[PDB]
Amino acid sequence: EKFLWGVATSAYQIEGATQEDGRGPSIWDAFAQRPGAIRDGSTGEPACDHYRRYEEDIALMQSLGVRAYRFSVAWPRILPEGRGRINPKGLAFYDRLVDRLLASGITPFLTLYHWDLPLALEERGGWRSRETAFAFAEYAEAVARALADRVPFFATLNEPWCSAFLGHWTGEHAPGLRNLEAALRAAHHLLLGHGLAVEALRAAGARRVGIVLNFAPAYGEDPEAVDVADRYHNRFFLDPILGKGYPESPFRDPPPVPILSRDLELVARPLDFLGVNYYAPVRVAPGTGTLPVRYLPPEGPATAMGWEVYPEGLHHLLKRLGREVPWPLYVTENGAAYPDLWTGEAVVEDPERVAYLEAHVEAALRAREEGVDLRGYFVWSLMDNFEWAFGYTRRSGLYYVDFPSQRRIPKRSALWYRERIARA
């Protein structure tokens, strides 16, 4: 089988067209309207204008020799109120995107939920409400019904840890809640929606179904604080998915999780793959409160995000997961933000991104050459885009995007990756 060399994006981060063609607003449209939620005061509009420029963007993928494209479908384009009414212009756009990928030799790799919950559902309680899980499954169904003839890979959710905890506890992500019980309700309904979606997907013909999780491996001098960090970030969604139930709580005095009877059996549905998102480890020490850990400074070289560059961390992570996960792994995101500047040249010099990607590729391939069933590697991202709370200030792309003209300019890392893929 062909190992999948890919690149990854998400709908709200690149599309624009936020109020075109019947698109309903999402929780990110509203969150971005709040003063100080986005550091540069920016919004999803108009991201990279990908909704009009997707031909051009696929041609960029072709010119790197990439063989797979990981993207998300915007739920609010498909069902503008989240449930019930279906907007055919929505499915028409993704239908045409899929045809073009196939005509260009590219394997579609589809994410159903990448954070853009329809605002209509959030105003009925969003992921805190059990009904949102059933709305998710109905959405998943309508997508596979239209797309599964040509899209081999569907992932239900992208990083539900961010959606639960950054979305409902630290309030850093949309909606923007700060309540641990709202977060645990959200974690449980994201998982319940995952399981219900799996059944809808298969019933509608999806061939490979999985999920994409974020791993931030924890290191430090005290094993106990390491284990608390690992339970909170690395096992809280994986263990349920694996059918081991939730891990022992990392929280002091947690509130109840609205686990209903049979929910855990629904959540632990057989999958065809696990998507691994990795960027950095975290160094921890013993800390005090609700979550009794303290997060320490990066040891040595760090990206613009202040995230430690530690390629060995990906290798170790893949070995550990290789023993524990009974499905093949895909690294569905890996990449780095550095402050790229462009002043007219035909290429944007990003030697730190080149260094970052080369070392991480060598790590992942090493895990595979030691017998991890690793079947693909995707760079976040194809191009510079809207980076959530960071707006346009953190550039992660293989292509530089000059946002005023939408011109795409290749960086050194694009040329590095093209040659990388070729040397297969």
Residues lying near Cl ion in the complex (CB under 5 A): 159, 161, 213-214, 237
Residue 114 marked in a binding site: yes
Closest contact distance (angstroms) between CB of 125 and Cl ion is 21
Residue 380 marked in a binding site: yes
Closest contact distance (angstroms) between CB of 317 and Cl ion is 13
DSSP 257-269: P---TTHHHHHT-
**Rounded to the nearest 10 degrees, how much is the dihedral formed by the CA atoms of 108, 384, 40, 112?**
10
Angle between helices 130-147 and 180-203 (to 10 degrees): 30
Nearer CB in complex with Cl ion: 111/214: 214
Q: In the block, which residue shows the tokens 């079947």? A: 375
C-alpha–C-alpha distance, residues 123 and 242, integer Å: 32
Nearer CB in complex with Cl ion: 114/208: 114
Closest contact distance (angstroms) between CB of 53 and Cl ion is 30
Nearer CB in complex with Cl ion: 79/212: 212
Closest contact distance (angstroms) between CB of 215 and Cl ion is 8
Residue 13 marked in a binding site: yes
Residue 392 marked in a binding site: no
C-alpha–C-alpha distance, residues 407 and 417, integer Å: 20
Residue 279 marked in a binding site: yes
Nearer CB in complex with Cl ion: 305/415: 305
Nearer CB in complex with Cl ion: 61/190: 190
Helix (H, G, I), strand (E, B), or coil: what is residue 309? Answer: coil
Closest contact distance (angstroms) between CB of 63 and Cl ion is 32
Closest contact distance (angstroms) between CB of 114 and Cl ion is 12
Cis bond leading into 46, ω under 30°?
A: yes
Q: What's the chain's Rg over C-alpha atoms? A: 20
DSSP H helices in 204-310:
223-230, 238-242, 263-267
DSSP H helices in 306-388:
311-324, 351-369
Task: Give me the residue whose beta carbon is nearest to Cl ion.
Answer: 161
Element (H, E) at 29: helix 27-31
- Which residues make Cβ contacts (< 8 Å) with residue 396, sequence separation at least 6? 335, 336, 337, 380, 381, 384, 385, 387
Best CA proximity match to 2, nearest among 333, 361, 380, 377? 377
**Rounded to the nearest 10 degrees, how much is the dihedral formed by the CA atoms of 155, 114, 74, 391?**
-150
Q: Are strands 68-72 and 153-158 parallel, antiparallel or unpaired?
A: unpaired
Q: In the block, which residue shows the tokens 């599309």? A: 15
Nearer CB in complex with Cl ion: 25/193: 193
Largest Cα span, the chain: 61
Q: Judge contact between 173 and 166, C-beta under 8 A.
A: yes
Closest contact distance (angstroms) between CB of 380 and Cl ion is 15
Q: Any idea which residues carry the catalytic annotation?
A: 159, 333
Nearer CB in complex with Cl ion: 87/156: 156
Show binding-site residues for substrate.
13, 114, 158, 279, 380, 387-388
Show binding-site residues.
13, 114, 158, 279, 380, 387-388
